[PDB]
Nucleic acid binder design. Sequence first.
DNA 1: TTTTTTTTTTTTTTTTTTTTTTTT
Lengths: 309, 309, 309, 309, 309, 309
Amino acid sequence: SFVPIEKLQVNGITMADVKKLRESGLHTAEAVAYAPRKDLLEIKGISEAKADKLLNEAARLVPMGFVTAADFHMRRSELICLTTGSKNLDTLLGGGVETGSITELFGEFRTGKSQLCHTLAVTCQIPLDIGGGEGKCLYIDTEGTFRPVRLVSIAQRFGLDPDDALNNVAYARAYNADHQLRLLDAAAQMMSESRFSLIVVDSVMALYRTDFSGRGELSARQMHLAKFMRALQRLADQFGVAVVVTNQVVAQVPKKPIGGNIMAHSSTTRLGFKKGKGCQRLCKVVDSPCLPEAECVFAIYEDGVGDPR
Amino acid sequence: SFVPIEKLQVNGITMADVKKLRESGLHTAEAVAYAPRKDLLEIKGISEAKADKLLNEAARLVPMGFVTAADFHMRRSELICLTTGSKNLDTLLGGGVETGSITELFGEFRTGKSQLCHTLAVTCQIPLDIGGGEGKCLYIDTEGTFRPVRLVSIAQRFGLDPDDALNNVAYARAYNADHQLRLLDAAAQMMSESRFSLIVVDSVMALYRTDFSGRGELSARQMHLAKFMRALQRLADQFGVAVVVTNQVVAQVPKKPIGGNIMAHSSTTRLGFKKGKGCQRLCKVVDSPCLPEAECVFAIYEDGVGDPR
Amino acid sequence: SFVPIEKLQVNGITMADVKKLRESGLHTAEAVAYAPRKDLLEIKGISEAKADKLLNEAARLVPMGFVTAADFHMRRSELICLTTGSKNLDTLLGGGVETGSITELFGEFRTGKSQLCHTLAVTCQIPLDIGGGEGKCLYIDTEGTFRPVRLVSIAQRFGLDPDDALNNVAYARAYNADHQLRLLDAAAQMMSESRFSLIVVDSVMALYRTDFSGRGELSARQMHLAKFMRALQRLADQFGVAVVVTNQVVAQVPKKPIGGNIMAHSSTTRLGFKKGKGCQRLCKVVDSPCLPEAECVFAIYEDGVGDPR
Amino acid sequence: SFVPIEKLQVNGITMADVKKLRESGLHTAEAVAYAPRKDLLEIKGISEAKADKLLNEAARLVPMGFVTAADFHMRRSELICLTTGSKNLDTLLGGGVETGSITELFGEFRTGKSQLCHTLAVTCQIPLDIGGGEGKCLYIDTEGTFRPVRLVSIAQRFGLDPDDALNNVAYARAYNADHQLRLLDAAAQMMSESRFSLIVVDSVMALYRTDFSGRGELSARQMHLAKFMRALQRLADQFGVAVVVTNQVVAQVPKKPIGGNIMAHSSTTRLGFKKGKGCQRLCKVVDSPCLPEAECVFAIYEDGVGDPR
Amino acid sequence: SFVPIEKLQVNGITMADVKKLRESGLHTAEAVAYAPRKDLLEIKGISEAKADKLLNEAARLVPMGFVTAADFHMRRSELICLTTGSKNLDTLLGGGVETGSITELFGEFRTGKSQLCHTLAVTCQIPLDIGGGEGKCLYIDTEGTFRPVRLVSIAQRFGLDPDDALNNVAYARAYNADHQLRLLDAAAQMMSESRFSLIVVDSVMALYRTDFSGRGELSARQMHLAKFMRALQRLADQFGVAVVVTNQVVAQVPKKPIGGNIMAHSSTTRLGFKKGKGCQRLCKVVDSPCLPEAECVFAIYEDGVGDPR
Amino acid sequence: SFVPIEKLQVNGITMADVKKLRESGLHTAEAVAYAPRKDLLEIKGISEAKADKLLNEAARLVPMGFVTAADFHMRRSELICLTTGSKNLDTLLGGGVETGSITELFGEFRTGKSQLCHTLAVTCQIPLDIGGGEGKCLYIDTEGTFRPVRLVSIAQRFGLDPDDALNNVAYARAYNADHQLRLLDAAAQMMSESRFSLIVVDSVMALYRTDFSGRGELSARQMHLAKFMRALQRLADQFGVAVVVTNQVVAQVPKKPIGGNIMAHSSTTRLGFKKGKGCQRLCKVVDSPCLPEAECVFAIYEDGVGDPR
DNA sequence: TTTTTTTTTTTTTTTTTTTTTTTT
Ligand SMILES: Nc1ncnc2c1ncn2[C@@H]1O[C@H](COP(=O)(O)OP(=O)(O)O)[C@@H](O)[C@H]1O
Ligand SMILES: Nc1ncnc2c1ncn2[C@@H]1O[C@H](COP(=O)(O)OP(=O)(O)O)[C@@H](O)[C@H]1O
Ligand SMILES: Nc1ncnc2c1ncn2[C@@H]1O[C@H](COP(=O)(O)OP(=O)(O)O)[C@@H](O)[C@H]1O
Ligand SMILES: Nc1ncnc2c1ncn2[C@@H]1O[C@H](COP(=O)(O)OP(=O)(O)O)[C@@H](O)[C@H]1O
Ligand SMILES: Nc1ncnc2c1ncn2[C@@H]1O[C@H](COP(=O)(O)OP(=O)(O)O)[C@@H](O)[C@H]1O
Ligand SMILES: Nc1ncnc2c1ncn2[C@@H]1O[C@H](COP(=O)(O)OP(=O)(O)O)[C@@H](O)[C@H]1O
Ligand SMILES: [Mg+2]
Ligand SMILES: [Mg+2]
Ligand SMILES: [Mg+2]
Ligand SMILES: [Mg+2]
Ligand SMILES: [Mg+2]
Ligand SMILES: [Mg+2]
């Protein structure tokens, strides 16, 4: 899928240089190709001359030019989608959650945002012919609501062994925004050794709310958030995984999501959740580059997300 | 349990540094590990190149990284749950009140919110064999309804010596929101010396209602409340105690709890109380990450909360 | 349309000099005539007494002097306008999108900026008698929202063949600001071999946000952006194409476009988009040298941009 | 109103010397009278002795000495002023735009700088008894915003014939700063053959911004600009025309014009524009040798600049 | 006042010698006394053994030797001082502008430098009792900002007849630096026939900026400027008049006057002007041999320079 | 302190020879003894015989031979040292300005060079017990900055009577370089009839710059300057007075004094001035035969040079 | 064989928050 970063060791580029690059956070040749020159010179040990040759070798292995739209159409026809467990939602989304972009879920409390993430963390492991991804899951939790018992219950409905299902999920907790950003380097390091398919951030704005307080700290908060979103997009470009994030709401003094224009402009797809009758929930498509606006109904059960019975 | 803060005395850090840190409000190595760097560059005497040292230390002692979900599942099966005195309530809660998270109780007047807190203040001192926690209780009051004469009667039912029961509860009264926030530092200091198991806040919104008035002060109220909730969650993370808070209701213009979206998103479990016939009452699960919705019946007697006769 | 650069090989200029000029990014005689002397001296091979000869010959081939306003009036009556697919919008613009200048579209999320670009990428290929351009399209994407499926649906409505329509669009993705500026040399190389009529940049400011962070890098950011805008205008002068760019908005601490005074002064026409009822949207003329301020309504359908139904 | 340069061949000077002078860029006897000797001894062919004869002969035809202030008052009380189409503006300026000096207009985008230039290009042709000039216009454009449709619309309001109006304006487009300076020699050549009354430069600093970049090229940029301003003032002295230039603004890191101290000291009159309500605009006098500070209001209509209802 | 030159005609000196001296710019006996023998021998028709007697004579008429400081104090106590029209300014300067020395004013655009010169050109004619000088004014303008209209208004405020005020000012315009130096011979010739009391040079540095461009011509520029300043001082010594000159500023790449050390060392008094609130301006003493540093406030009105209110 | 020239009257010598020598400019036997025989030849009236006799005489009256270093060391102990009015300066200079040598001060404009000379002109009359010289002062001015009011103010601070203080200073003004050289003969004649202690030249290079312009005339300027400095040193040797001179600076294309190597080698002590905060100034030792290189601080007040508070 | 001089010039915006309270 990607080009190993060891193939950049020619014409006087040694292994110590590659070790310095890995210590900086780059783990593939694509990561080197996508970075600007001013970024590479902020590493203690990389002189101006090398920074040029490094950029010349990477471009020979990673294509960056012009193609026709027919070629891009053919390539895009081969991306896989992940099933949500509900037929209504799969039809509404055009197949499921798609790899290579960012999907956002928002709503008020107990509307079902964490249950769907739990369901996807299982369906990302199953065979491709039933809507799976045949990969692993990386889960980052900023609120403390992750529950392995739900995973154990869900894995039985899809014919899995609970031991392997629990072994194939990597989990981490974050305590402030700097730690939240720091964890992405470890994620990138782990992604280059085995095959993953999904990343979850639940939720993305909870710690920013209190780490920066009031007017007078707004600009710095928005700048930090923009850096985080750019890093997530770069990971999706490098490894071809799906990315899912959650968000909270506030009242207009009737409810709207938080994070402002930075949040609104950088998400590929946006979905809104609402509370229904009993165990039923309502879903609406709020933003998309290729889908119309519409609505549907789903339900929460002991074994996960499904269709109303 | 935790790691003493005195272990951050390896290199270039003197007892004066730890004294300054303890002045700032930190009494554990976890507290230093969980704080952002921008927060450390605010204590007179710590400037730079030292905050970066205290951060490198306490990460070797306190883990912050990825694990498997099977390890997390094994660790979570060791948490303690405290009995409520009623079989139906314990069955509905999946065991009782669980350490490490936040539970909220809401309802209209004389629905039984304070009697349950009084009963929990006793059940947390008894041995783990019968559903206790073998620890002390910290009780903060903002309405003036704490009555030590109920504790004597309740303790006489569980085979406790009344004088020991009364000596093992710490009590404080608050007069405004700033005082309420300030008491938490003293709580942390006390918890770093002896062993505690439970914390009660009764009630959390009573003083906010009158300290801030009108739409022109609404934004400043919610930020203060968010800071308070974050501090409570940090204490629960540090010491592994249970946290219980109470809340009032209002009319729509049929009744809903006060506090807005900050309150609704920051709580882990939510329970609603209603009035029944005679001494009986009804309880309902309104929000939870691993339990379905259901209801049961309990009763109030001269010896505490129990099952209907 | 343009004078080929091979006509400059006279009176001592050989093929090696033209090869060096081409490698430096010049592909037409007009490009040589528009460059200052200080620019030519910075190319290896051109020393002196040769740049002067090149400039004299280019001025002989390309006119740069005074004419009467009647001649310019006659010449400007032969410019082509491209239809947007909506009659209200075409009337509001005096005919459509005009070749030889720069048009800017700004608004908040999901207001319809990318859908109009997709529609224009098809209408630039149809015959002149129905508002087409009879040429090819070049598309540069910095956000990853280009979707070939919309082109098939839009091409079906205008009587085009989908395979031919997909073969006549050239597509490229950019990953940082240096790469974005670099792609224009390849664009200029491609335009001198076959006929194009439209260029799209979607969007112009997305990567500048994160590549330059905070105050202290603001001047360098603005200077880089000024260079990019000047290159776009030079391409429009050289080849007689239409240029369309998109832009994001920010809050005033009620919304305004980003990019400052450089962006405000560099654009020829400026249009603002707003969200309406259902699938309807509103457009407003914010700046123009020959049109008054006015407003209209348009709509988004499965087959593109059109009039309300 | 000027002495032809053919009067200098009296005793010892021939037609070849005058041809050399004309090729170097001198077209009147006043031009020879105002040039320093070091400049004359720089044309191929002209040596000493001859360079000493011309300088003497010119002094006999162009007076350079002391006079009384009463005589200067009498002469200055016979200068033409050009109407702007608005009565408020004419009152604020003391009659209109003054021949023999330099006027500068600055402001942010779409504040009306180019519309007033378009109106003046028409009013410079009408008879003297209604505020006109009975002359021709020369227009230099560095941004590409010149539109003859506005001229056709404006000429009808004043009773002119549109074909005559279009035949009496000379137009040129500049592509870099060297070309911009080079066009003034052709301007002088043209002005020595027919009667003109106005010159427009719109705008003056647009190409300097990008032709020189950064700290290391600031001195050369300012020196080039000083030469351009001196040449403009020389033309105004030579032929008795009015000179109008436009300028852009930047933010103070609330807005100020660009060009430094050279521009600020070189202009005779300075006016600032601001955006009002609907089609209304505000004008302020920022610098002048004989007028106090004050403000007024004007408006833009389909037929040019006028009074607010 | 001064000793006429005709008195030199003794001991075999004819009128032809005196005419030859007058043709070279010498118009008094003090001028011949102040000149060195080397300069004298550069005149055609005056050779050795003639300069010997020319220098021997004029030493009996003009004294050049030693005296006591008390006598010089007595002589200096009889120097006229002109009034600026403002009491704060007259107090800050010790009485007004002093005859026999050089005063320089510097500042940025529209700080009031030319208005004060216009006011002095009137106050130099009023009787000695009210602070005048009872003489004529000589005015040299290099920028083109002289306005006789202000003189009428200013004269109406001091009880003067406007026509006589306008007839008592001599005005000249300079077109390059050689012409600027040439005009001083005519000034000296005029001053030997009628009584003058003030000389004005408005922007002594404006033409030097462009006449010598860039490094490589700096030495010649400074040498020419030094000659001009020396001639000004000689005139002030010869006729006992006051001398006022103006100057521009540049940015320190927070502003400083131009001209270098040659200008800084040859000015007796230096004053800096700054912009205030409304029509108010601030003045500061920057250099002087007998005054301390201080500040004051003045204002500009339709009748000239005056007190803040 | 000197042998009168009238003491050289012996056999073969008459009054006419002494009168002729006095006319030439020799006033003491030391001057005749120090004059090489070649010099005593252009004096019309003395060719041979007389010159040899005069040289033989004054050898017995003035010692010309070898002495022990101890005798010279003892004789050097009877040297006066004038106070500068500042304690820091007196400490840095080792006591004050010393008689018998040459001191030079240099710096930029308004650095305090003339104020110190004014103060010395007064302190040179104070009694020896408090650092005086009990003599008169000779002042030569080439710029026109001498102000007796400062002397009157300074006299009171030291207990002197201003009427008497003004009568003990001789003042002269120089108009060109030849006159500047000529004044020294009169100075020497004056010093042979009364007791003087100080001599001041302010400044020494102001007229040389303009009397000799540019290259080609160089080295004649330098020969003239060398002669002037040799004459100054001869006076200092003859009469045992202190000598002080001033100097200007130029920029290096950070500033350096003017005069070349002649001035650099001829001076005995060199001091540099710099501007400080408020009325404070900084002094630096740049050259001295027997002193280290240190710094100091002083200030200027209404009564002269003093300590920085 | 000889003997140093003399300063200049401004640039360029960013970025949302947060519910209240029964009546006959
Ligand atoms: N085992 C279970 N069986 C049925 N419903 C459950 C179970 N666990 C949780 N739920 C339901 O899921 C809801 C919580 O949804 P969640 O995704 O945690 O909300 P949020 O949108 O805040 O993330 C609760 O209303 C609860 O009733
Ligand atoms: N000793 C007691 N015996 C029986 N019932 C009691 C006793 N003390 C209080 N109660 C009951 O408890 C109720 C008070 O409930 P409480 O928890 O204080 O209400 P809230 O929900 O406002 O906190 C009263 O209705 C009262 O009847
Ligand atoms: N196939 C389709 N049919 C109908 N509407 C669509 C279709 N695809 C996208 N849309 C609508 O277009 C809108 C997105 O507009 P777009 O131009 O991508 O926004 P932006 O202004 O951010 O570029 C969405 O609201 C979506 O509902
Ligand atoms: N034909 C017209 N009728 C009415 N208003 C017009 C017409 N043409 C242009 N305008 C108005 O003039 C303004 C453009 O001002 P302009 O002078 O070009 O700006 P700038 O100050 O940038 O030069 C626009 O806001 C536009 O609405
Ligand atoms: N008749 C007048 N009445 C009031 N103020 C005037 C008049 N004429 C000129 N001014 C003011 O004088 C100022 C110009 O000052 P000036 O001395 O010309 O500046 P500079 O320092 O550039 O020479 C302007 O700001 C203007 O407002
Ligand atoms: N009477 C006074 N009171 C206070 N300060 C004065 C007085 N006279 C002159 N000065 C200060 O002395 C300084 C002039 O120093 P001076 O020695 O003349 O400079 P230079 O080094 O050019 O000769 C000025 O800055 C001035 O402020
Ligand atoms: Mg939630
Ligand atoms: Mg209650
Ligand atoms: Mg968008
Ligand atoms: Mg504009
Ligand atoms: Mg000015
Ligand atoms: Mg000085």
